Amino acid sequence: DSIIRFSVSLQQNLLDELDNRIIKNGYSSRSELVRDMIREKLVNPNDESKIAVLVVIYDHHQRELNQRMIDIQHASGTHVLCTTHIHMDEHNCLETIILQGNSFEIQRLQLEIGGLRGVKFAKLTKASSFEY
Amino acid sequence: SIIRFSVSLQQNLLDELDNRIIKNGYSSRSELVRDMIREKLVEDNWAEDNPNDESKIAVLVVIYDHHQRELNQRMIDIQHASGTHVLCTTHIHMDEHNCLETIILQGNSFEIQRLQLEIGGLRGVKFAKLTKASSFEYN
Amino acid sequence: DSIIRFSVSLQQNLLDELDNRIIKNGYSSRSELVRDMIREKLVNPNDESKIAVLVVIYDHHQRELNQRMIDIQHASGTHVLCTTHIHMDEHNCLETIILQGNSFEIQRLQLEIGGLRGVKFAKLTKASSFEY
Amino acid sequence: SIIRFSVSLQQNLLDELDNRIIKNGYSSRSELVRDMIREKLVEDNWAEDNPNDESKIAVLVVIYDHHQRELNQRMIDIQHASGTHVLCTTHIHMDEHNCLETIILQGNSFEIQRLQLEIGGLRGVKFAKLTKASSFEYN
Numbered sequence: 221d222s223i224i225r226f227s228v229s230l231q232q233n234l235l236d237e238l239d240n241r242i243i244k245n246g247y248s249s250r251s252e253l254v255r256d257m258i259r260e261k262l263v264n265p266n267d268e269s270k271i272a273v274l275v276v277i278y279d280h281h282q283r284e285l286n287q288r289m290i291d292i293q294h295a296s297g298t299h300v301l302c303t304t305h306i307h308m309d310e311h312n313c314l315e316t317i318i319l320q321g322n323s324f325e326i327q328r329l330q331l332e333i334g335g336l337r338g339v340k341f342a343k344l345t346k347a348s349s350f351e352y
Numbered sequence: 353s354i355i356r357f358s359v360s361l362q363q364n365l366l367d368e369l370d371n372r373i374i375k376n377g378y379s380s381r382s383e384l385v386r387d388m389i390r391e392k393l394v395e396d397n398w399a400e401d402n403p404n405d406e407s408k409i410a411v412l413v414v415i416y417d418h419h420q421r422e423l424n425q426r427m428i429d430i431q432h433a434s435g436t437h438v439l440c441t442t443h444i445h446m447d448e449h450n451c452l453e454t455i456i457l458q459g460n461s462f463e464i465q466r467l468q469l470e471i472g473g474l475r476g477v478k479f480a481k482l483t484k485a486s487s488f489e490y491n
Numbered sequence: 492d493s494i495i496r497f498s499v500s501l502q503q504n505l506l507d508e509l510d511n512r513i514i515k516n517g518y519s520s521r522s523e524l525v526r527d528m529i530r531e532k533l534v535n536p537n538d539e540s541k542i543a544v545l546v547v548i549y550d551h552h553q554r555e556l557n558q559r560m561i562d563i564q565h566a567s568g569t570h571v572l573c574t575t576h577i578h579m580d581e582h583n584c585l586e587t588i589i590l591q592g593n594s595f596e597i598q599r600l601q602l603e604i605g606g607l608r609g610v611k612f613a614k615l616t617k618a619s620s621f622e623y
Numbered sequence: 624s625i626i627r628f629s630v631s632l633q634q635n636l637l638d639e640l641d642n643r644i645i646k647n648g649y650s651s652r653s654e655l656v657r658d659m660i661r662e663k664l665v666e667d668n669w670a671e672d673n674p675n676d677e678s679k680i681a682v683l684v685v686i687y688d689h690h691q692r693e694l695n696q697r698m699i700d701i702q703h704a705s706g707t708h709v710l711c712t713t714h715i716h717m718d719e720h721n722c723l724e725t726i727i728l729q730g731n732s733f734e735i736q737r738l739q740l741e742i743g744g745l746r747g748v749k750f751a752k753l754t755k756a757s758s759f760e761y762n
Contacts, residue, residue: 251357512667
């Protein structure tokens with residue numbers, strides 16, 4: 221219980237926003253702000269079927285991206301109930317994927333989609349049935 | 353590119369963090385910290401939003417009782433008074449008593465947040481959660 | 492087999508387009524054009540489950556319209572798989588309803604939705620499973 | 624308003640028409656003739672379309688094999704070359720081998736029809752049907 225140093229990797233876009241926030245909010249380093257973000261954000265996956273929504277924003281000019289997300293969905297074990305796509309601007313589409321699955325299936329789907337080249341983000345909203 | 357840098361932290365905080373890597377699906381501590389950072393930067397961005405900005409995007413996810421008469425209109429009237437622009441909405445019926453709706457919204461951070469708050473307060477609405485995006489993520 | 496006279500009622504908007512088409516295409520009366528339309532368009536509902544899509548365009552400022560369409564859907568016997576709405580212009584929304592049901596259920600849904608005040612049209616696309 | 628007028632017809636044509644009223648769900652001959660008229664007026668309108676017009680709306684409904692690799696990209700590439708604007712697309716999986724997609728399109732009548740024709744010719748596409756609308760119906 222004592223100070224440890226570890227490494228973190230960010231895409232330029234996130235790193236750039238980080239550095240602006242450090243400057244805007246009066247922090248003295250990346251380490252200091254990230255450390256504070258972790259402390260703040262720190263304050264059980266199971267087999268039960270849950271409905272979830274994954275919002276993905278992606279580059280609509282990235283070839284085979286939709287195919288790779290389909291491939292990911294097909295293998296995930298989740299059941300896709302619906303997907304909707306709209307063009308949000310000149311470079312990006314926004315897709316919502318409404319799906320059912322257990323925690324492990326849905327989490328893996330979100331992380332695999334999120335790490336695709338051309339995917340700007342993939343944010344999951346989960347509703348377990350106690351939430352309704 | 354993608355840039356690597358160091359962070360310093362108490363070992364017992366690092367132990368609470370390392371606790372959460374594998375169980376949440378991550379291959380490394382780095383991936384999990386990245387998502388905490390993304391999440392917090394988007395919140396900070398939405399907090400400083402110009403009231404003159406009307407270009408924020410978000411998705412509101414709502415679970416509600418579709419057999420509750422007048423709930424649908426009350427939601428429409430709230431949306432019409434919010435100042436936001438609905439780009440697209442999707443509905444699926446989970447069962448005879450739950451409908452899930454996704455609402456794709458454009459507007460000011462205030463107006464969008466207000467919409468979520470007002471919808472979430474209605475009788476028959478079980479769940480109302482915003483997914484926020486910030487232009488630094490996709491521009 | 493001999494000539495009969497019957498009556499037809501159209502909303503102003505359809506009647507107006509009819510009269511323009513009569514003039515554009517060289518017809519001499521409504522009766523003549525409608526008679527020709529019928530001849531041309533003339534050239535079995537069952538219990539089998541079919542997937543279908545209903546495209547509805549409607550006035551987004553008509554209060555309780557969505558409620559009435561929901562009421563109609565709920566009573567129809569059809570299972571709605573998904574509905575999507577977009578704003579198409581300043582007065583109109585476009586909704587697509589993807590649904591499963593038998594011929595009688597889906598036909599009744601289309602006709603009941605189509606006759607609502609504020610509904611500009613409701614066009615059904617049906618796929619029986621021999622169509623795929 | 625809503626305006627009533629008379630139509631003359633041979634009795635044996637009227638008998639083929641009256642054959643189709645109740646079975647197709649109609650309460651009267653008038654309702655069925657109205658829908659034939661709507662259908663034909665929309666077709667005529669789409670046939671005289673200005674190649675300078677890009678404001679027509681239609682929905683393309685497509686059933687296809689979602690497990691056929693590369694079909695998705697081929698459809699995207701066709702849509703990108705069509706000249707049309709996709710406003711929204713929705714996909715549902717009917718089973719492991721059929722997906723139904725609805726595509727909401729804006730463009731010229733030519734470009735939209737061409738898109739339907741090209742998509743419908745692809746291996747793995749089982750069904751591709753346009754629902755057309757004309758501004759006289761909704762403006």
